[PDB]
Amino acid sequence: GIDKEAMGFTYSGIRTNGATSACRRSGSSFYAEMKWLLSNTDNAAFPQMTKS
Amino acid sequence: YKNTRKSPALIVWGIHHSVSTAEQTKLYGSGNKLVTVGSSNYQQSFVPSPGAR
Amino acid sequence: NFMLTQPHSVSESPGKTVTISCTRSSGSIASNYVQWYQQRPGSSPTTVIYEDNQRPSGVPDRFSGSIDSSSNSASLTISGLKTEDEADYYCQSYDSSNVVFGGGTKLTVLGQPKAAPSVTLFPPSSEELQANKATLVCLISDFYPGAVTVAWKADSSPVKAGVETTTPSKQSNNKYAASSYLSLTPEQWKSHRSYSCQVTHEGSTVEKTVAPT
Amino acid sequence: NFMLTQPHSVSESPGKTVTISCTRSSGSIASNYVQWYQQRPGSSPTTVIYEDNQRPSGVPDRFSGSIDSSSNSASLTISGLKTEDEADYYCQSYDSSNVVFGGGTKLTVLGQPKAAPSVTLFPPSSEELQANKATLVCLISDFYPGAVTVAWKADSSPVKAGVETTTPSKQSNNKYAASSYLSLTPEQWKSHRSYSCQVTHEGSTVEKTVAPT
């Protein structure tokens, strides 16, 4: 069996709520354990990031 | 390089992945970087992947 | 949510080259695809541009869409205008679950020189005031291209309350004429000193004003 | 190694936009990273740019870095100047094991109209010529902004040895003053044809000359 633990990643200035109706949890959702990172709705540009 | 000897030659080389494109452009110049390697048997090409490790 | 903004009328001569712009108020225009639809008069729309530059099957390659991140606007550029290109043009974009349509652009191919409107504003008839009713009539006539921005102003201030404005119609002399009606109550009529009818044509405004007595 | 060259004086009005350039004598400018430090008077320097364009957290977005490989220059740029941006700006770059510092640039936000300096040049007194000494006094008053460059010339030729130049300090009337004293010996004083004090302010030069007797 597998025991899960948060990795504590914090994102600023981008969209982290990507989803689709293919992973349908009563609505357009996404993988429970992942985050579909998108560009900021304001400025369409994804900055270079470093998460550790 | 031509292997003039009777035994196969162990050729080794490195591809540098700079910390950032800024660093890459400062060292090896701007523009898309590309390294190719070829022989009769072996062929393979390499492009640097700059980023933080 | 946001909204898209188009110009009311884009005008050019046959064979020339027009660009209809479509500015997005909130959020990048580049964060989603922008479509252009074409509504020829009295008929259902068709698409001319999708995914901001792609043309479907059967659209003349004169039609070219683009995107400008600096102005935060789209663009529909038509080369070599043909008289079959006179129609209404709506851009379209999209947000989380909401599809936003542009205001609409009246593309006019010039077949005669540009004419400025001839405005006349009638105050309510005193006969009407006997019926406890007030009706102001702003009559516009003899302009080309046909596209008008009627703005009613009670004494200094915009009043869009009771206004009902007809869509322009081709006059007998191949020009365009339209009407406006600000329906009121005799109290509001006798309240303010002046009631104006502002017509805007080619960014050039004319004001006709009436007053009680 | 190499040397970096920034202007001594830069000035502009609040809200306007300045650029401070930094030119490298030898070696390309894009062969290593360039910094921009700022030193508000009475405080340690702080770094407003690194890696030629990067703002530290807490540096207003009006600061930008740049690299022009054609002119071999790196250029700071400040948008919408504030009054707190008034400081000295040093550029910095790097070689084999050598850290090169620019000369420094005085950035003045104009709070009053510019005023060319007033130069008054005195010869050595005959009494000091009896002490077997000789001293030239170049007094510079009533200039704004507070940046000058003092150059001495021995009869047609730069003389840098023996010169002592003051840092400009504010007078009573919110204008700056400075002094410059060239040390000499009476044998060199009677030797040449003339002596000059050249004060450079905002790209204009005011030259004054003196002579023996």
Side-chain angles (χ1 to χ4, degrees), chain A residues 41-44, chain C residues 27-28 30-31:
Chain A
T41 318
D42 283 58
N43 57 312
Chain C
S28 158
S31 70

PDB file of all heavy atoms in Angstrom, chain A residues 41-44, chain C residues 27-28 30-31:
ATOM      1  N   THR A  41      -4.517  34.235 -16.265  1.00  0.00           N
ATOM      2  CA  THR A  41      -5.584  34.723 -17.134  1.00  0.00           C
ATOM      3  C   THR A  41      -5.344  36.171 -17.550  1.00  0.00           C
ATOM      4  O   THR A  41      -5.763  36.581 -18.638  1.00  0.00           O
ATOM      5  CB  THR A  41      -6.940  34.595 -16.436  1.00  0.00           C
ATOM      6  OG1 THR A  41      -7.014  33.336 -15.763  1.00  0.00           O
ATOM      7  CG2 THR A  41      -8.061  34.666 -17.456  1.00  0.00           C
ATOM      8  N   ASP A  42      -4.650  36.948 -16.709  1.00  0.00           N
ATOM      9  CA  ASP A  42      -4.376  38.348 -17.024  1.00  0.00           C
ATOM     10  C   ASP A  42      -3.346  38.475 -18.140  1.00  0.00           C
ATOM     11  O   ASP A  42      -3.643  39.003 -19.216  1.00  0.00           O
ATOM     12  CB  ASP A  42      -3.903  39.090 -15.769  1.00  0.00           C
ATOM     13  CG  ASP A  42      -5.047  39.428 -14.824  1.00  0.00           C
ATOM     14  OD1 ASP A  42      -5.752  38.489 -14.383  1.00  0.00           O
ATOM     15  OD2 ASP A  42      -5.244  40.631 -14.529  1.00  0.00           O
ATOM     16  N   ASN A  43      -2.129  37.996 -17.905  1.00  0.00           N
ATOM     17  CA  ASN A  43      -1.064  38.016 -18.904  1.00  0.00           C
ATOM     18  C   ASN A  43      -0.792  36.593 -19.378  1.00  0.00           C
ATOM     19  O   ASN A  43      -0.494  35.708 -18.566  1.00  0.00           O
ATOM     20  CB  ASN A  43       0.209  38.643 -18.337  1.00  0.00           C
ATOM     21  CG  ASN A  43       0.703  37.929 -17.084  1.00  0.00           C
ATOM     22  OD1 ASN A  43      -0.074  37.665 -16.159  1.00  0.00           O
ATOM     23  ND2 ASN A  43       1.992  37.574 -17.069  1.00  0.00           N
ATOM     24  N   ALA A  44      -0.894  36.372 -20.688  1.00  0.00           N
ATOM     25  CA  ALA A  44      -0.728  35.031 -21.248  1.00  0.00           C
ATOM     26  C   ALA A  44       0.762  34.760 -21.428  1.00  0.00           C
ATOM     27  O   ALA A  44       1.325  34.861 -22.519  1.00  0.00           O
ATOM     28  CB  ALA A  44      -1.492  34.888 -22.559  1.00  0.00           C
TER      29      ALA A  44
ATOM     30  N   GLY C  27      -8.482  40.597 -18.831  1.00  0.00           N
ATOM     31  CA  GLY C  27      -7.748  39.405 -19.204  1.00  0.00           C
ATOM     32  C   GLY C  27      -7.115  39.518 -20.577  1.00  0.00           C
ATOM     33  O   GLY C  27      -7.581  40.289 -21.422  1.00  0.00           O
ATOM     34  N   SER C  28      -6.045  38.756 -20.806  1.00  0.00           N
ATOM     35  CA  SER C  28      -5.372  38.777 -22.099  1.00  0.00           C
ATOM     36  C   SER C  28      -6.305  38.308 -23.210  1.00  0.00           C
ATOM     37  O   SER C  28      -7.137  37.418 -23.015  1.00  0.00           O
ATOM     38  CB  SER C  28      -4.131  37.886 -22.069  1.00  0.00           C
ATOM     39  OG  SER C  28      -3.773  37.499 -23.387  1.00  0.00           O
ATOM     40  N   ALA C  30      -4.931  36.921 -25.687  1.00  0.00           N
ATOM     41  CA  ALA C  30      -4.154  35.773 -26.132  1.00  0.00           C
ATOM     42  C   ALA C  30      -4.396  34.522 -25.291  1.00  0.00           C
ATOM     43  O   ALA C  30      -3.992  33.424 -25.701  1.00  0.00           O
ATOM     44  CB  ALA C  30      -2.662  36.133 -26.128  1.00  0.00           C
ATOM     45  N   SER C  31      -5.038  34.652 -24.134  1.00  0.00           N
ATOM     46  CA  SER C  31      -5.298  33.508 -23.274  1.00  0.00           C
ATOM     47  C   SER C  31      -6.458  32.648 -23.783  1.00  0.00           C
ATOM     48  O   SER C  31      -6.852  31.695 -23.104  1.00  0.00           O
ATOM     49  CB  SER C  31      -5.552  33.976 -21.830  1.00  0.00           C
ATOM     50  OG  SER C  31      -6.790  34.651 -21.696  1.00  0.00           O
TER      51      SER C  31
END
